[PDB]
Design a protein around this ligand. Structure first.
Ligand code: ADP
Ligand code: ADP
Ligand code: MG
Ligand code: MG
Ligand code: ZN
Ligand code: ZN
Lengths: 212, 629, 590
DNA sequence: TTTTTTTTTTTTTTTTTTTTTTTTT
DNA sequence: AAAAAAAAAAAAAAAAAAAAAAAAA
């Protein structure tokens, strides 16, 4: 989004990975790819694509001890979460745990932590939600009804299955803003995720049980 | 010798036919599983070689199949296992020759329609197919999944019967390598191009296409479910219905696809599919399916006597109830209800009565606040029984829960596909968050709960799909909390007609009890750091389904009548769930279910009393009052 | 010219059987059957496979295991059997129809091993395509040498001669109809959709199957092709079609009478003279339903129905009575609907929201084999001259309720879709089951308020039956006793004076009667209608209008039809008036 | 070389389902 | 404020009319 022209929309390009360049990138992964811009023959108009040669996962998708052993190291990470956001010392310490998450036990109880920041307008709720997105390894930030319905869950698109923010955020942190003003069906879908950690769909063209 | 479409080095390999043949014969003649458990292998004289007894069974029954466990070969000889897995095409014919030689050396006078063909199974499980590689092409693999759909029979030619247009001379050409060599010149009168192929006089085998959903135990982050295509050939057609959970062992086939269904040009990219070699319906983490119950030879006499002895213990019911979901604490009544649901009532035939089908399953609605361990029970039962399904309210629709129509993107034909409810025909449908369900999709459940059928009438086809499902629904109180100020029926927030369908509405409330809180905290903490085994409960349920067919008795009938009258009097209040005639039927089922637990084969006073007690304990009728609340 | 010795021997033995087999009387029965083969529109001889087994067991076995490769030879044997006896046209062809095959196979059992050999199956007809002329063997002209390649046999595909040896007027055609069937409910395996294989019918038996009928097809499974690719599809070729459960062992009253056997007519006539046949029919048709005598009587009169009539101006007088059932849950409404469906032939049952408009009324598709279009019959159509049981009527969408109202109004469905228009007939009575609004019937309101049916829908319902669940202890005890007796003794405990088959035959016979209305009955009707209108002068559950006079006339007609009477006596009018009066319920209020 | 049947592509419309929105208690 | 019914979106399927290319003789 930082490099799209002011009045334009992001442009998409095709990449044909092969050999040992497969199963390296999943949907939603920020990737720098070095390949060859080659056309596929169809005047002699020709489509294009990138023949992948080197795939690297960047930023959050990217893939000393003395300070970690410190007593206050717990506070330091907390104080380092969105430092420009003054105060909220306790909240950041709670979000820190959300990033770390509990530990799954299978005697199957989930090990995730769900934190809802409810408050009055202009108390930097969104900024923290936006900050977590730029920090968590796998994350998705959906706001209100802009990305609703199939935006969260999956859809059928041969017919393949495409996951929504939850699926892309699977084993990650899905930052939901304005949860209260979310579509009632979407809230129901989340209810399953925060307890079942799955998305059971039985629509017309879809009958699966996703893993979120 | 029925040809199988599924199927010095020969060429570019590491196998010589004689070596594999002799090694397989040896393995078949001198293999004993040391850790074999008598129950694990029923009706087999363990001390003697296993597969020779298998051959004896084949001689007796006549089934010309030998289910060979690939793990047995792996243990006995790893090199032969490598050869088999790497080159299933060449190895399996060698095994067929070996087993035929062994079984005609002994029993030289046995009669079979064709020769005996081996079926390797339980090959090293491929956790996730996506992890498969082009290096794994044309190799035996075993996967586990659920069958979404099965297509109708497709006849595939094996021998072409040609006749001369002039002299009518008949010859049978045989498929060579996927092609038939048209003679192009008659052998009788020598006329050119006078041989025409005749379809109906030719020889055909079967081929069934099965679209199967895999349940890969290795689920990388963000990976969507995966569906694959299987081909079943000449005996495995319609061996698995939609909804069945299977372990499929077969050859990983990749075939060319033509850019159009008419031009000979093919995409550089292939698309892969499995040729089924063996189906395994057994799973140690679930109960026995209906097919396993159907076949009689599943319970060794010792195991049958063990189950009989278990049934004679007074605490059989409570021991069985305590077995379900050991990680859930002191839900004795709920677990008893789920046990009665698993056992199910008698399946009766009412065609002669002119009454129609009668529902013999049991539907349990757990109404409770979100905090209570509701969804855990539903997920456990969904992860316990076969032919089970799960739904989460707003995530489903009526058409998707009943049936729909779609263009199969491998034959490009508009075909009808079943829904979630049908897939669990003879299983259990766990409907979670039942309250958060629009009335449109809810309306469907009425027929599935009373009639057990689903009569669709749409442009595509008009027909009624039979669905004998048992519904395990979970609902939250209106306002997400069971406020004691509102009456029971008001708090449930469901139409009275629908609540009448359910035969057990368990109210999961939170009694502010210190002892219960302390014990539950102890239990949960113990779980965080951590009986009657599955192998015995599973067998008990399978046997009870197979043999026990309880029939009502005089005293049971009288007690049921009196109990129904008492229920009608009790539920006649304003806020309590009113009692209808449909509830009497419910009691019957429950009673029968309990009578099925004791293997009584006849419902008597105790069973009806237990059914009435369980129903009254549900709805907390004792803890309620005429001033409902 | 190689001779198929097996086929020739089969032909010889079959001809010997045809010219030698004798019935019980000792006469050559098949000679008598062939006697009718001379007349045009008659080119098929029905031969019972039981006779074939009795005469020559080896021949029957050979035919069963080699049906397809010998059927042409059986046809040739029949042609020789008939030609030498009479002066049939030389070009006329003849076909052999087998029936009474002892064993039946399931649609799931039609494996490739059954290809090209005799088999009988049972199924439900989904739809029948039109009838076409089919080319079996004609003439071909080479455009390179004008050498006429003659009598090339077509195998379900336009098959030109493969190589030159070097028209229509001179060809032989046979009737051909591709009718699609589907698997029966009993045969359906757990959790699987029904299977459909398009069976193909030929001369004579080219329209014996209609959409919605349960039929047994006897014939052969075959493969049809759909460098070259051999893509084959299974298809059934049937040489005979018969009902799966024949109504009569042997359309106007006398024709139906002769259609029956001697014993069936004895039974029908005996019950026609059976005084109190009304109560006997009520009990026998609903043995497991306690009480609710009024609803049973209503559905019985519905099964019989009135007498349709046409006005001089062309107005159509509805002659089929509809019924609706409304009340508290667990009042055995859906049980009444299921009883009517399972009993009455041509009875189709549906649900509230499970049926769309097209599948509930009709649809159109284009024939895959010609330029014409075929009509997929919806639920309403399959109930033609029958009954449609709509359970949970109140839940039905308005887009569909409009269609149901149209069907009740003018009995017809008008379609303008997919390049074709059509006005099709739907002479169906409607048995609806509607839940009261709020899920319980409120006695302090008119019927209009207790249910969510639109006024037009209710207007044309002849009978409304209210089933309130009064919490009476005696009724509860009786209901419990009956239900427990049912569930204790399943097969027995049902002593119905007349078997459902006997009642079906009696209904089919009685439906043909068209009772008159004598002057005495007319005066009695006038007085009864006067009194019934005076009833509305406390309040009733719904007003009484002239439509109630129409309902009373129709109910009297149905009552007359029940006893197979020819004139509506005053007693029938009295009974109809009493039943309709009981159907009206007072709106009690504090 | 010259025909022919197919192949596509390019528009357009139609039908089912789902989702979104509007009205009522 | 929440549920029921209606309307619109949108996606998939069908007709089809016409221009171009590959296979056949
Ligand atoms: N505690 C805080 N410290 C620093 N900035 C804040 C704080 N609270 C609010 N803001 C400022 O308010 C602006 C909008 O905040 P926003 O995240 O939209 O509030 P909310 O989402 O809670 O309504 C941000 O630019 C942020 O810089
Ligand atoms: N009067 C009665 N006699 C016999 N059985 C009855 C009677 N009333 C109710 N029942 C039983 O109650 C059960 C449920 O009735 P049902 O028809 O499903 O209710 P609804 O009319 O609401 O659909 C039926 O199986 C039926 O056997
Ligand atoms: Mg905000
Ligand atoms: Mg009902
Ligand atoms: Zn020849
Ligand atoms: Zn020629």
């Amino acid at each position: 989004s930082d490099q799209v022209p002011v009045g334009n929309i992001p442009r998409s390009i095709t990449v044909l990975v092969e050999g040992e360049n497969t199963r390296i990138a999943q949907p939603g992964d920020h990737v720098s790819v070095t390949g060859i811009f080659l056309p596929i023959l169809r005047g002699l108009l020709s489509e294009t694509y990138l023949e992948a040669h080197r795939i690297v996962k960047m930023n959050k998708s990217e893939d000393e001890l003395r300070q970690i052993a410190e007593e206050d190291f717990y506070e330091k990470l907390a104080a380092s979460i969105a430092p420009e956001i003054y105060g909220h010392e306790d909240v950041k310490k709670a979000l820190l745990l959300l990033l770390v998450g509990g530990v799954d036990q299978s005697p199957k109880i989930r090990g995730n932590i769900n934190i809802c920041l409810m408050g009055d307008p202009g108390v930097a709720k969104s900024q923290l939600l936006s900050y977590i997105d730029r920090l968590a390894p796998r994350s998705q930030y959906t706001t209100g009804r802009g990305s609703s319905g199939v935006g969260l869950t999956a859809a059928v698109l041969e017919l393949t299955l495409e996951g929504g923010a939850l699926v892309l955020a699977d084993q990650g942190v899905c930052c939901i803003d304005e949860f209260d003003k979310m579509a009632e069906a979407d809230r129901t879908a989340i209810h399953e995720v925060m307890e079942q950690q799955t998305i059971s769909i039985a629509k017309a063209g879809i009958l699966t049980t996703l893993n979120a | 010798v029925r040809q199988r479409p599924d199927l010095l080095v020969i060429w570019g390999t590491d196998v010589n036919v004689a070596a594999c043949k002799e090694n397989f014969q040896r393995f078949l003649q001198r293999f004993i599983d040391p850790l074999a458990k008598e129950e694990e292998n029923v009706g087999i004289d363990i001390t003697e070689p296993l597969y020779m007894q298998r051959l004896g069974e084949i001689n007796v029954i006549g089934e010309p199949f030998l289910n060979v466990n690939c793990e047995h070969i792996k243990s006995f000889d790893k090199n032969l296992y490598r050869q088999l897995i790497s080159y299933p095409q060449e190895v399996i014919p060698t095994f067929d020759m070996a087993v035929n030689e062994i079984f005609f050396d002994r029993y030289p006078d046995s009669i079979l329609e064709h020769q005996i063909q081996v079926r390797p199974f339980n090959a090293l499980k491929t956790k996730n197919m996506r992890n498969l590689n082009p290096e794994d092409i044309d190799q035996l693999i075993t996967i586990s999944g659920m069958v979404i759909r099965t297509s109708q029979l497709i006849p595939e030619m094996q021998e072409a019967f040609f006749q001369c247009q002039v002299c009518a001379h008949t010859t049978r050409v045989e498929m060579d390598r996927g092609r038939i060599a048209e003679p192009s010149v008659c052998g009788r009168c020598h006329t050119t191009h006078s041989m025409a192929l005749i379809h109906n006089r030719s020889l055909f085998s079967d081929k069934q296409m099965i679209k199967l959903q895999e349940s890969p135990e290795d689920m990388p982050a963000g990976q969507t479910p995966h569906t694959v295509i299987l081909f079943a050939h000449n005996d495995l057609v319609d061996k698995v219905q939609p909804g069945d959970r299977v372990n499929v062992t077969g050859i990983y086939r990749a075939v060319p696809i033509r850019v159009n269904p008419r031009v000979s040009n093919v995409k550089s990219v292939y698309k892969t599919h499995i040729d089924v070699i063996h189906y395994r319906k057994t799973d140690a983490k679930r109960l026995h399916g209906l097919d396993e119950e159907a076949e009689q030879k599943l319970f060794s006499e010792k195991r049958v006597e063990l189950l009989k002895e278990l049934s004679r213990k007074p605490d059989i019911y409570e021991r069985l109830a305590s077995a379900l979901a050991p990680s859930i604490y002191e839900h004795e009544d709920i677990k008893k209800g789920i046990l009665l649901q698993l056992f199910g009532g008698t399946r009766k035939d009412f065609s002669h009565t002119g009454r129609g089908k009668f529902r013999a399953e049991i539907n349990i609605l757990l109404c409770g606040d979100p905090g209570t361990s509701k969804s855990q029970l539903l997920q456990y039962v969904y992860n316990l029984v076969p032919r089970g399904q799960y739904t989460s309210g707003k995530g489903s629709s009526a058409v998707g829960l009943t049936a729909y129509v779609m263009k199969d993107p491998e034959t490009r034909q508009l075909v009808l596909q079943t829904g979630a409810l049908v897939l669990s025909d003879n299983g259990i449908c766990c409907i979670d968050e039942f309250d958060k369900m629009n009335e449109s999709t809810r309306s469907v459940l009425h027929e599935v709960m009373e009639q057990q059928t689903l009569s669709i009438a749409k442009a595509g086809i008009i027909c009624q799909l039979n669905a004998r499902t048992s519904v395990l629904a979970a609902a939250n109180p209106i306002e997400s909390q069971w406020n004691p100020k509102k009456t029971t029926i008001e708090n449930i927030q469901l139409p009275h007609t629908l609540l009448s369908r359910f035969d057990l509405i368990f109210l999961m409330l939170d009694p502010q009890d210190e002892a219960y809180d302390r014990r539950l905290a102890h239990h949960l903490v113990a779980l965080y750091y951590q009986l009657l085994d599955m192998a015995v409960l599973k067998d008990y349920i399978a046997y009870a389904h197979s043999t026990i067919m309880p029939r009502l008795s005089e005293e049971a009938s009288q007690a049921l009548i009196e109990a129904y009258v008492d229920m009608r009097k009790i539920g006649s209040s304003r806020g309590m769930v009113s009692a209808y005639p449909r509830q009497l039927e419910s009691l019957i089922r429950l009673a029968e279910a309990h009578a099925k637990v004791r293997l009584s084969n006849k419902v008597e006073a105790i069973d009806v009393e237990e059914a009435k007690r369980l129903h009254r304990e549900a709805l907390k009728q004792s803890a309620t009052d005429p001033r409902t609340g | 010219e190689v001779r198929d010795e097996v086929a020739e021997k089969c032909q010889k033995l079959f001809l010997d059987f045809l010219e030698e087999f004798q019935s019980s009387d000792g006469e050559i029965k098949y000679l008598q059957l062939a006697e009718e083969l001379i007349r045009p529109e008659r080119n098929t001889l029905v031969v019972s496979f039981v006779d074939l087994e009795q005469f020559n067991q080896q021949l029957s076995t050979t035919i069963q295991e080699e049906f397809y490769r010998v059927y042409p030879y059986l046809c040739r044997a029949l042609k020789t059997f008939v030609k030498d006896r009479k002066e049939i046209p030389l070009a006329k062809d003849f076909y052999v129809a087998f029936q009474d095959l002892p064993t039946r196979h399931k649609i799931r059992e039609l494996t490739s091993s059954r290809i090209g050999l005799l088999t009988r199956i049972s199924g439900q007809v989904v739809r029948t395509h039109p009838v076409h002329p089919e080319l079996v063997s004609g003439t071909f002209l080479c455009l390179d040498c004008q050498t006429v390649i003659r009598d090339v046999e077509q195998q379900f595909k336009y098959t030109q001669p493969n190589i030159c040896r070097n028209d229509t007027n001179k060809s032989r055609f046979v009737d051909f109809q591709k009718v699609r069937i589907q698997e029966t409910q009993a045969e359906l395996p757990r959790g699987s959709i029904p299977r459909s294989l398009e069976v193909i019918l030929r001369a004579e038996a080219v329209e014996s199957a209609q959409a919605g009928d349960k039929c047994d097809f006897t014939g052969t499974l075959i493969v049809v092709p759909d460098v070259r690719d051999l893509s084959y599809r299974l298809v059934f070729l049937a040489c005979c079609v018969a009902p799966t459960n024949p109504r009569f062992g042997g359309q106007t009253a006398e024709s139906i009478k002769n259609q029956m056997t001697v014993k069936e007519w004895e039974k029908v006539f005996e019950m026609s003279q059976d005084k109190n046949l009304y109560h006997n029919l009520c009990t026998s048709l609903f043995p497991t339903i306690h009480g609710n005598d009024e609803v049973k009587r209503g559905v019985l009169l519905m099964l019989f129905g009135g007498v349709p009539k046409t006005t001089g101006e062309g107005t159509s007088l509805r002659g089929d009575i509809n019924v609706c059932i409304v009340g508290d849950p667990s009042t055995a409404k859906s049980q009444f609907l299921k009883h009517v469906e399972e009993f009455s032939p041509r009875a189709v049952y549906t649900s509230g929201k499970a049926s769309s408009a097209a599948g509930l009324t009709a649809a159109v598709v284009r024939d895959e084999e010609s330029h014409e279009f075929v009509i997929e019959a919806g639920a309403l159509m399959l109930a033609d001259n029958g009954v449609c049981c709509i359970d949970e009527f109140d839940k039905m969408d308005v887009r569909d309720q409009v269609a149901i109202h149209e069907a009740m109004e003018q009995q017809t469905i008008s379609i303008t879709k997919a390049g074709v228009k059509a006005t099709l007939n739907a002479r169906t009575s409607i048995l609806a089951a509607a839940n009261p609004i709020s899920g319980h019937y409120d006695r302090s309101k008119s019927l209009k308020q207790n249910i969510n049916l639109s006024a037009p829908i209710m207007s044309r319902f002849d009978l409304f039956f209210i089933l309130v669940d009064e919490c009476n202890e005696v009724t509860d005890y009786a209901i419990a006793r009956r239900i427990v007796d049912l569930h204790s003794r399943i097969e027995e405990s049902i002593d119905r004076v007349y078997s459902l088959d006997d009642i079906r035959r009696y209904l089919l016979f009685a439906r043909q009667f068209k009772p008159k209305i004598s002057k005495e009955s007319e005066d009695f009707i006038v007085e009864q209608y006067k009194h019934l209108r005076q009833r509305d002068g406390t309040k009733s559950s719904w007003r009484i209008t002239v439509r109630q006079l129409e309902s009373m006339i129709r109910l009297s007609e149905a009552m007359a039809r029940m006893h197979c009477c020819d004139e509506v006596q005053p007693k029938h009018v009295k009974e109809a008036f009493r039943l309709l009066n009981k159907s009206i319920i007072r709106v009690e209020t504090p």
